[PDB]
Design a protein around this ligand. Structure first.
Ligand SMILES: [Mg+2]
Ligand SMILES: [Mg+2]
Ligand SMILES: [Mg+2]
Ligand SMILES: [Mg+2]
Ligand SMILES: [Mg+2]
Ligand SMILES: [Mg+2]
Ligand SMILES: [Mg+2]
Ligand SMILES: [Mg+2]
Ligand SMILES: [Mg+2]
Ligand SMILES: [Mg+2]
Ligand SMILES: [Mg+2]
Ligand SMILES: [Mg+2]
Ligand SMILES: [Mg+2]
Ligand SMILES: [Mg+2]
Ligand SMILES: [Mg+2]
Ligand SMILES: [Mg+2]
Ligand SMILES: [Mg+2]
Ligand SMILES: [Mg+2]
Ligand SMILES: [Mg+2]
Ligand SMILES: [Mg+2]
Ligand SMILES: [Mg+2]
Ligand SMILES: [Mg+2]
Ligand SMILES: [Mg+2]
Ligand SMILES: [Mg+2]
Ligand SMILES: [Mg+2]
Ligand SMILES: [Mg+2]
Ligand SMILES: [Mg+2]
Lengths: 69, 145, 63, 107, 61, 141, 141, 56, 206, 56
RNA sequence: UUGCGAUAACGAACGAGACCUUAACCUACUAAAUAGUGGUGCUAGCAUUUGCUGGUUAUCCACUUCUUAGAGGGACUAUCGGUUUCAAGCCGAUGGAAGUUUGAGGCAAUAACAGGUCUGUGAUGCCCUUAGACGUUCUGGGCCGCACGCGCGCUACACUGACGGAGCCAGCGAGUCUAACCUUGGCCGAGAGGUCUUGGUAAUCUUGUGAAACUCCGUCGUGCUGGGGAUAGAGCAUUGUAAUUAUUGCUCUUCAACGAGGAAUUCCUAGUAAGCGCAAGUCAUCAGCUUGCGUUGAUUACGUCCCUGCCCUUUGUACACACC
């Protein structure tokens, strides 16, 4: 149901849809993409390392991310 | 101590040890669908097999599957410490065994029918369909079992 | 719909069979000295402002 | 026998705080007129012995519970004193109701 | 519920009936002179008697 | 500019000192790691599976630093938790004593703690020095 | 010697004894700076007496708070009460009374519990139920 | 018993006591038991004055 | 007006808290006008606090919870359904992340959004029972402002908790979506839907 | 004598209760009312309050 | 039935209240190597140049804030508004440690009940039994037996969570030589536990009972799933003369119902409900129980007589053994 591996088309859909997500979190990737929460956590970490989303809270159990600029 | 990324080339549902193991489940928890293999046993076998613990059981290599099967089937030869097993000090040969997928019901029937055969009290209760661990039968187990 | 606001002047007393409803006198904020008695469900006190959906219904239930 | 101190400690245990603090007041006044150096009467935390019972002798009724208490108060007075003139007046007017123990020390 | 019983009230009446050129509109000195002009057996009862006596003096005012 | 192991947060210090111990590789991990649970009250073994003994030894060393005498039984009570007893209610159960005894013996032979004639282990002078240098690095990052 | 007061703050069973003296801005809590208290989300409770009156009022005092008893929240409330009462006590004994009254008004306009201990004490448990008011569930059948 | 209990009650009351009570419970020539009281004077029933001024 | 230096270095972000008491350290309580007069003096803002945790006595008198802060009241309504009893630290964390999300989505002030959500779902008319039992009737009556605030907070937190139960979305973001939809007035949120149900029943049972 | 204070004072109470029932059963035909125990150094004295000392 | 008032009554007594116990305040008193704190006669460390510490009370000095417990003080609803028959009182505000009888109990009248207890008693009338005993003891079994109906509960149905690691905080108790109790520390063991020592007849030592919920960082990811842990197999221990009908504990495996519960029904108004554990009781061993304790701590009302029960008054009575 929810993807636990990421294919290349899912990876480019992440990098072309998570920018211009106004608010980004684990459940936001889980429901607006069709990935699971483990890839959602991994993708959040990877995308803030790249720097096109930027953090606000970075709590465990709840990460609030917004878009960069 | 730092985290680097990993790419997921995948295989679907996989027959392992005559049991359909589900890929898309992490390897410790995917191997727990095998009977005789619980969570502690899965974690210890996946640690003795040098298998990555984060490796989702369908992206696992066939030879890594084979090492997991060998350690599961012959655990005392991979330094699994023999207090960790299903059948220690067995009933008939004194050998520590860990009993796996289809053999757990077989050893369960061997234990129970040995216990019927000697006309022991617990085997009599198993034959009668009652609780065997000294439970009070007046109020509990009163719709099924 | 143009609701009307009303200020509580006097708490006239608990009504209703279980005593949860209270009865108050209120006066209208626009058009002052136009006054009506209302049944109020919650905890109300003098000078409380409350919003009437209807401006023409006098409370009858008492004692 | 010529003004030699002993380093004694007198522990006073009772259940009746009127009689007990009367005995400790008498000990403090005795030291305070014999000019003995003394640590004053140190008051330990009063111990409460609680016993919770059911009131009924059978097992019928509402489950009513009784808490009984015994209260034990403890003091101690340290002294540095000449024993042979302390015990010339210690052994008289012996206190009832209060358990006294005198322990000598060399610490 | 702060209604005061007849042991407080009768004591206050029997204090104002004979010690009026005394006790005044102040609880603290009324509380002090109840200890002299009466034998109230507890401090709480003395405080209730003195406060009701003061409440009565503020009414005779 | 003097830094003790009180000026820095506990989690930051314990992560930094565990990484220092894992990078120096002198702490003599006992080898029944990967099989043990860390308590009877636990359900699963530690999820790190490499590390966690450095984290336990870092926490123990910081604990000895902040106290005066800690023994093995005190450590077991400290690291215990609430045991699920299934259908019966939860309860405190002490942690595994062999793990904490071997952590204490390991910090003895790397010189962080010592044998303390009033009881358990007190910290050594070299232990105070090493922990203070780690705390200084943890602040000045 | 040095000018110094000692105060305390009290929540339910926590007691924080604070030693305030003439110094250079130190604010320590039982070994550690005020900036690490745990809970993190309640750290602004103990920042409140620092920030209601300004940090400029704390530049010539050293505060050392030993908090014992209670629990995690209750210790935080006793700490903030101890710090506020210690600063008011230092300004009562050494600084102007007008300054002390302005500090007291600044605390009390925000929170009365900064200087006054909450009198709410646990009511005893009664037989016939698990709690003080609550009773055991009764059957009729 | 109406001789005995009253002869205890008057003896206590002119012995210089504030109040006296005698309760006799049991069976006396009838199977069905009853209880009967014999009180003269003033008695307190509640509070610390019971532990202070009452012998029972 | 200057950064004070001490033997314990107080950080700069918390040194700007001298000039203004913000919620947690981010959001101002100024320009937090309550749009619905008749809910002023029951939605209590304008006495700022630093965190939504206070050991305040509000239950010993009739109207002291009107002087309890509205953020503490919304926080207090999150610590229920039994397993969350106690756990105000968890509730305060949920409120902190909720105001974070309400700032990220819809960039205006989150305290203003939650007070608009209170005033948009406080029900102005409600029915009561009349009659001595089952053989009864139902009468429409007005609603007190304190009751409106109480029932608004209950309707927001209950529909947050139900939406967060048994799915991937967290309580701090179902609460955020609930408060944002309520603050607009949407009829997608539980609280606005139940307020409309209450007032429709009141009109039908005048 | 190497006993706790909590147990020593309780045992003194039990000794008092046992003497009380022993003298209640023994000295009942000469009006025993009470007993008081005074523990002294190397003596303990037992005072029997009775209405008739001559038959005690 | 607390008073104010009205008044063929007036003035009183029991019960209520007062009282006692406990909780809350006291930088006011008296003090303390069985409670702490500050210095330093003394020294000793680590970063350093003063922050965090470790240790000696005729091999230190001083103090009492915190703790303890004695003596007291303190609140009387004070004061001020409003309301009331300018009463009894009630509400609001300010002050105050406290303004819900300040919180909570203990005690508790007149009388009853065919209420319970003869199996608590060497409390007891009568009857029954008394050597083939219904006395007493010993062995074994049973009280736990299981198609089922009911009551009190515990554990859950998960993401406001489970798991892992890390952080890390109480209060009420209890304890052995008038014989084996509470046990620190060291060592061995995955664990349960074993062993060698130690301290404590206890504000001294167990014990800062380092309790759990909780907090942080991770793993999981809406799937009866890593929720749940019933049932069952094998093994290792402990208690005990004895564990089988599993005493209990541990380890591995097995992994059921249960996705929030008809009809109905319980408890509850503030440090209360609820959540969370801890100690004691019984105890050789056994807590899902009770008695208390503390930790975290809401929502809602400050009302009514609608339901239910109780009380009063009037009323009717052919009832008084009193509607059984
Ligand atoms: Mg399994
Ligand atoms: Mg069972
Ligand atoms: Mg712990
Ligand atoms: Mg832990
Ligand atoms: Mg409770
Ligand atoms: Mg009386
Ligand atoms: Mg009374
Ligand atoms: Mg779920
Ligand atoms: Mg003092
Ligand atoms: Mg009968
Ligand atoms: Mg009987
Ligand atoms: Mg008989
Ligand atoms: Mg019996
Ligand atoms: Mg037998
Ligand atoms: Mg039975
Ligand atoms: Mg019951
Ligand atoms: Mg956890
Ligand atoms: Mg403690
Ligand atoms: Mg210890
Ligand atoms: Mg499962
Ligand atoms: Mg058995
Ligand atoms: Mg059996
Ligand atoms: Mg027990
Ligand atoms: Mg048993
Ligand atoms: Mg029982
Ligand atoms: Mg009725
Ligand atoms: Mg008749």
């Amino acid at each position: 149901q929810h993807a636990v591996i990421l294919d290349q088309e899912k990876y480019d859909r992440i990098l072309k849809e998570v920018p211009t997500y106004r608010y980004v979190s684990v459940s936001v990737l889980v429901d607006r993409l069709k990935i699971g929460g483990s890839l959602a956590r991994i993708a959040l970490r990877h995308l803030e390392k790249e720097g096109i989303i930027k953090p606000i809270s970075k709590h465990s159990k709840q990460a609030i991310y917004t878009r960069a600029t | 101590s730092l985290v680097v990324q990993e790419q997921g080339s995948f295989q679907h549902i996989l027959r392992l040890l005559n049991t359909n193991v589900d890929g898309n489940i992490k390897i410790v928890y995917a191997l727990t669908t095998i009977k005789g293999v619980g969570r502690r046993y899965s974690n210890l076998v996946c640690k003795k097999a040098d298998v990555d613990l984060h490796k989702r059981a369908g992206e696992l290599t066939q030879e890594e599957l084979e090492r997991i099967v060998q350690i599961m089937q012959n655990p005392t030869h991979y330094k699994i410490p023999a207090w960790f097993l299903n059948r220690q000090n067995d009933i008939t040969d004194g050998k520590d065994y860990h009993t796996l997928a289809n053999n757990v019901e077989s050893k369960l029937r061997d234990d129970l029918e040995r216990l019927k055969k000697i006309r022991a009290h617990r085997g009599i209760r198993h034959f009668w369909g009652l609780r065997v661990r000294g439970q009070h039968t007046k109020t509990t187990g009163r719709r099924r079992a | 719909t143009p609701v009307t606001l009303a200020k509580v002047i006097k708490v006239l007393g608990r009504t209703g069979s279980r005593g949860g409803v209270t009865q108050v006198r209120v006066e209208f904020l626009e058009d002052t000295s136009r006054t009506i008695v209302r049944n109020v469900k919650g905890p109300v006190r003098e000078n409380d402002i409350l919003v009437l959906m209807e401006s023409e219904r006098e409370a009858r239930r008492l004692r | 026998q010529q003004q030699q101190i002993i380093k004694i400690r007198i522990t006073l245990t009772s259940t009746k705080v009127k009689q007990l603090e009367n005995v400790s007041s008498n000990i403090v006044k005795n030291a305070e007129q014999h000019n003995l150096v003394k640590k004053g009467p140190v008051r330990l935390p009063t111990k409460v012995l609680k016993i919770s019972t059911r009131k009924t002798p059978n097992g019928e009724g509402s489950k009513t519970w009784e808490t009984y208490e015994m209260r034990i108060h403890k003091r101690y007075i340290d002294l540095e004193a000449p024993v042979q003139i302390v015990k010339r007046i210690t052994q008289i007017t012996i206190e009832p109701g209060v358990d006294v123990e005198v322990v000598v020390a060399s610490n | 519920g702060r209604v005061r019983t007849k042991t407080v009230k009768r004591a206050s009446k029997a204090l104002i009936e004979r010690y009026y050129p005394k006790l005044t509109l102040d609880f603290q000195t009324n509380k002090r002179l109840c200890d002299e002009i009466a034998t109230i057996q507890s401090k709480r009862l003395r405080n209730k008697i003195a406060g009701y006596t003061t409440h009565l003096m503020k009414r005779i005012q | 500019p003097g830094v003790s192991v009180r000026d820095v947060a506990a989690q930051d210090f314990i992560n930094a000192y565990a990484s220092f111990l894992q990078r120096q590789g002198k702490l003599e991990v006992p080898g029944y790691v990967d099989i043990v649970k860390t308590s009877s009250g636990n359900e699963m073994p530690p999820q790190d599976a490499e590390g966690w003994f450095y984290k336990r030894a870092a926490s123990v060393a910081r604990h000895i630093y902040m106290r005066k005498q800690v023994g093995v039984g005190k450590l077991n009570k400290l690291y215990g938790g609430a045991k699920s007893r299934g259908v019966r209610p939860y309860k405190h159960i002490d942690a595994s004593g062999s793990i904490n005894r071997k952590v204490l013996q390991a910090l003895e032979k790397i010189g962080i703690v010592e044998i303390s004639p009033k009881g358990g282990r007190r910290i050594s002078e070299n232990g105070q020095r090493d922990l203070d240098r780690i705390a200084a690095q943890t602040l000045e990052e | 010697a040095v000018p110094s007061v000692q105060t305390f703050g009290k929540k339910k069973s926590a007691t924080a004894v604070a030693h305030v003296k003439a110094g250079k801005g130190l604010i320590k809590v039982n070994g550690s700076p005020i900036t690490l208290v745990e809970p993190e989300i309640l750290r602004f409770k103990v920042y409140e007496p620092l920030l209601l009156v300004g940090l400029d009022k704390f530049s010539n005092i050293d505060i050392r708070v030993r908090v014992t008893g209670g629990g995690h929240v209750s210790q935080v409330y006793a700490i903030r009460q101890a710090i506020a009462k210690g600063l008011v006590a230092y300004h009562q004994k050494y600084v102007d009374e007008q300054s002390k009254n302005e500090l007291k008004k600044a605390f009390t306009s925000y929170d009365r519990t900064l200087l006054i201990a909450d009198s709410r004490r646990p009511e005893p448990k009664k037989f016939g139920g698990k709690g003080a008011r609550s009773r055991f569930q009764k059957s009729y059948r | 018993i109406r001789r005995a209990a009253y002869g205890v009650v008057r003896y206590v009351m002119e012995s210089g006591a504030k109040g006296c009570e005698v309760v006799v419970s049991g069976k006396l020539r009838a199977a069905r038991a009853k209880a009967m009281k014999f009180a003269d004077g003033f008695l307190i029933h509640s509070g610390q004055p019971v532990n202070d001024f009452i012998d029972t | 007006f200057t950064p004070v230096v001490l033997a314990t270095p107080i950080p700069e972000e918390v040194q700007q808290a001298q000039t203004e008491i913000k919620l947690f350290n981010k959001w101002s309580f100024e320009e937090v006008e309550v749009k619905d007069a008749s809910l002023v003096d029951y939605v209590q803002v304008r006495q700022p606090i630093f965190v939504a945790h206070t050991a305040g006595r509000y239950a010993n008198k009739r109207f002291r919870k009107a002087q309890c802060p509205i953020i503490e009241r919304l926080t207090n309504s999150l610590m229920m359904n039994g397993r969350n009893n106690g756990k105000k630290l968890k509730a305060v964390r949920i409120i902190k992340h909720t105001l974070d999300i309400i700032n990220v989505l819809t960039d205006q002030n989150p305290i203003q959004v939650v007070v608009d959500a209170i005033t948009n779902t406080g029900p102005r008319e409600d029915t009561t029972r009349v009659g001595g039992g089952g053989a009864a009737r139902r009468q429409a009556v007005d609603v007190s402002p304190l009751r409106r605030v109480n029932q608004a907070i209950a309707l927001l937190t209950i529909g947050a908790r139900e939406a967060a139960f048994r799915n991937i979305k967290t309580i701090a973001e179902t609460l955020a979506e609930e408060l944002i939809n309520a603050a607009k007035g949407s009829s997608t949120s539980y609280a606005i839907k139940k307020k409309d149900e209450l007032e429709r029943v009141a009109k039908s049972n005048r | 004598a190497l006993i706790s204070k909590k147990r020593k004072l309780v045992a003194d109470g039990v000794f008092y209760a046992e003497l009380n029932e022993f003298f209640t059963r023994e000295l009942a035909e000469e009006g025993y009312s009470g007993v008081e125990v005074r523990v002294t150094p190397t003596k303990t004295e037992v005072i029997i309050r009775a209405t008739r000392t001559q038959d005690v």
